[PDB]
Amino acid sequence: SLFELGKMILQETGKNPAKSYGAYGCNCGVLGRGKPKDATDRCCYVHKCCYKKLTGCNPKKDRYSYSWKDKTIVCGENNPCLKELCECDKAVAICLRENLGTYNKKYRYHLKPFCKKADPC
Amino acid sequence: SLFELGKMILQETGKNPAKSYGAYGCNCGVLGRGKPKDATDRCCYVHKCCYKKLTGCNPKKDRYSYSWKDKTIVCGENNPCLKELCECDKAVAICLRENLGTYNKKYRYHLKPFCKKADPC
Numbered sequence: 001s002l003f004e005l006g007k008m009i010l011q012e013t014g015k016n017p018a019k020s021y022g023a024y025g026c027n028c029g030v031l032g033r034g035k036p037k038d039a040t041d042r043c044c045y046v047h048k049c050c051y052k053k054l055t056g057c058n059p060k061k062d063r064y065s066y067s068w069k070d071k072t073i074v075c076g077e078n079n080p081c082l083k084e085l086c087e088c089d090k091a092v093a094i095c096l097r098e099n100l101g102t103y104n105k106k107y108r109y110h111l112k113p114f115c116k117k118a119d120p121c
Numbered sequence: 122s123l124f125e126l127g128k129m130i131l132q133e134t135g136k137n138p139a140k141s142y143g144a145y146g147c148n149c150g151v152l153g154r155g156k157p158k159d160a161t162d163r164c165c166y167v168h169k170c171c172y173k174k175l176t177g178c179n180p181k182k183d184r185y186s187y188s189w190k191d192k193t194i195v196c197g198e199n200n201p202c203l204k205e206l207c208e209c210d211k212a213v214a215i216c217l218r219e220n221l222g223t224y225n226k227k228y229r230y231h232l233k234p235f236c237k238k239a240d241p242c
Contacts (some may be wrong), residue, residue: 002151003234018144018151019230029143031123031181060151060181109140112124 001063004086008066008073008093013100021096025107026115034115040103043095049121050088056081059088066090122184125207129187129194129214134221142217146228147236155236158228164216170242171209178202180209187211 009017018029025041026034027048036042051059056079064086065076073093075086130138146162147155148169157163172180177200185207186197194214196207 006152007234016230016232022143022150022230023139029139109137 001059001061004064004066005089005092008089009096011068011073012093012097015096015100020103020108023109025110026112026118030110030112030115033118033121034112035118037107037110037115038102038104039099040096041107043092043099045118046095047088047092050091051085052121054081054085054088057085059085122180122182125185125187126180126210126213129210130217132189132194133214133218136217136221141224141229144230144233146231147233147239150233152233152236154239154242155233156239158231159223159225160220161217161224162228164213164220166239167216168209168213171212172206173242175202175206175209178206180206 006017009015009021013020015021021040021044022029024030024044025037027036027041027044029044033045033048036045062082062085064079064082066086067074067076073090075083075090077083077086127138130136130142134141136142142149142161142165144150145165146158147166148157148162149165154166154169157166178185183203183206185199185203187207188195188197194207194211196204196211198204199207
């Protein structure tokens, strides 16, 4: 669920997830997808396409188990949907961390009319 | 949908909805409800309870029509669920405006996990 997502994002990036990613570019936090503004935004794009793949569970609402083991997010589910959901969330958190280097605050609260249509997932 | 909600919030409060209300206190934004931090947060609390009453539409994704008439949000007829949704959104936007005077930025990006469990709606 978004709780696990947010926790993962905090754990990977060390950043408050809402402030940094609650509305970043065309894909992070905002409703739906848009052409990514940058790598950070692209993480969220990928994440949303990751969500679109899921069948069996609700990415927003469904809680799942994961662990922090040797400073790695370790998904703790066997259920295929929750596992993939967890892995979607893990991937985005990692991706966000990995792209902090090009994170650009100007994309915080990016305005939707500046978003081009996203490529299909 | 979030689009109309954000627009109404913008219209009523004059504030960028994502920045000001995308993550505020225990109730504004994602992660359901929690004991409210302040009146602004209670607006979002009531809002979330309002959403729980909805049947037949998706508060997050379903767009609906409303008009700005005499500087008032006027929900379109839409259909019963969408109109009720519209009314939920209108109410929160109004509530947030009425309480802008005590908006406290310290609650922006409040870590919702650090929220006491909300009472049932």
